[PDB]
Design a protein around this ligand. Structure first.
Ligand SMILES: C=CC[C@@H]1/C=C(\C)C[C@H](C)C[C@H](OC)[C@H]2O[C@@](O)(C(=O)C(=O)N3CCCC[C@H]3C(=O)O[C@H](/C(C)=C/[C@@H]3CC[C@@H](O)[C@H](OC)C3)[C@H](C)[C@@H](O)CC1=O)[C@H](C)C[C@@H]2OC
Ligand SMILES: C=CC[C@@H]1/C=C(\C)C[C@H](C)C[C@H](OC)[C@H]2O[C@@](O)(C(=O)C(=O)N3CCCC[C@H]3C(=O)O[C@H](/C(C)=C/[C@@H]3CC[C@@H](O)[C@H](OC)C3)[C@H](C)[C@@H](O)CC1=O)[C@H](C)C[C@@H]2OC
Ligand SMILES: [Ca+2]
Ligand SMILES: [Ca+2]
Lengths: 113, 113
């Protein structure tokens, strides 16, 4: 599998290519995800709550790295995102979970579009 | 299981009670469904398309019987809705699938909220 670095600085890698429908901006998508800090510390997983996460792709209600990075996935796909801080939580971080200026790694599994 | 007839004329019956979170107006819910006419002719199923159906419960983008009927389901539950035409497609029906003045029967499986 290849790694793609976009103009924004996002990096992504398809760990498994999906066989289903393609995710496009505008669609309401459902995913499972896991998030880690660059030291390997897991900070969150939707699988731990057994609760798929739904959002409007390109809707501006998730961090920029997600809105950009989930586009192009196919249902059944697992994509790994490496999100630099300007496309995540930037200088502020996310109180008690994500430090200031953090690069974030997510694995995203696309369940439906 | 019991059958409930609401003030609107909607009838619903919980074929299986869900064990997960309750569906409330406002939530974006994901379901599988099958739809039939009162003579048992199947007109649609999301299972046949392998494509779960997401919608905003109470958002007015589904027939009135759905917006009302899916409220109160729990994740994992299967609810049968009997929808009179005034809470469905009324006198117009829906070209080449649902005739005028059709009572509709749906089975709805709540996948996520
Ligand atoms: C009303 C609020 C509750 C509402 C909560 C949910 C829908 C449940 C949902 C599963 C979130 C998780 O709850 C278990 C939990 O997910 C994290 O652990 C996480 O993995 C993460 O990073 N995710 C979630 C998955 C999408 C990407 C990213 C995100 O974009 O999250 C978004 C986020 C926090 C954006 C901030 C918003 C503030 C800005 O200042 C900042 O701008 C830089 C960016 C989330 C989706 C918000 O849009 C909406 C919410 O917050 C956060 C570390 C903290 C967060 O809990 C709050
Ligand atoms: C932009 C258009 C595409 C867009 C299509 C999708 C998102 C895909 C989605 C799975 C629909 C199915 O696509 C395969 C297919 O589902 C049926 O087979 C069906 O089982 C059905 O009855 N459903 C769908 C499940 C929710 C309840 C109900 C519905 O409320 O459907 C709504 C409906 C048709 C409402 C009419 C709208 C016009 C009014 O005049 C009338 O007012 C009384 C009510 C649907 C969700 C619309 O909001 C949005 C759309 O149409 C219809 C028999 C025909 C319909 O395809 C068209
Ligand atoms: Ca959910
Ligand atoms: Ca879908």
């Amino acid at each position: 599998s290849t790694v793609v670095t976009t103009e924004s600085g996002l990096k992504y890698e398809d760990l498994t290519e999906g066989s289903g429908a393609e995710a496009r901006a505008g669609q309401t998508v459902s995913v499972h995800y896991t998030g880690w800090l660059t030291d390997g510390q897991k900070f969150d997983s939707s699988k731990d709550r057994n609760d798929p996460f739904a959002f409007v792709l390109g809707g501006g209600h998730v961090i920029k790295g997600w809105d950009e990075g989930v586009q192009g996935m196919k249902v059944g796909g697992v994509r790994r995102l490496t999100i630099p801080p300007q496309l995540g939580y930037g200088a502020r971080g996310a109180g008690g979970v994500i430090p200031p200026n953090a690069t974030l790694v997510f694995e995203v599994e696309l369940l439906d579009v």
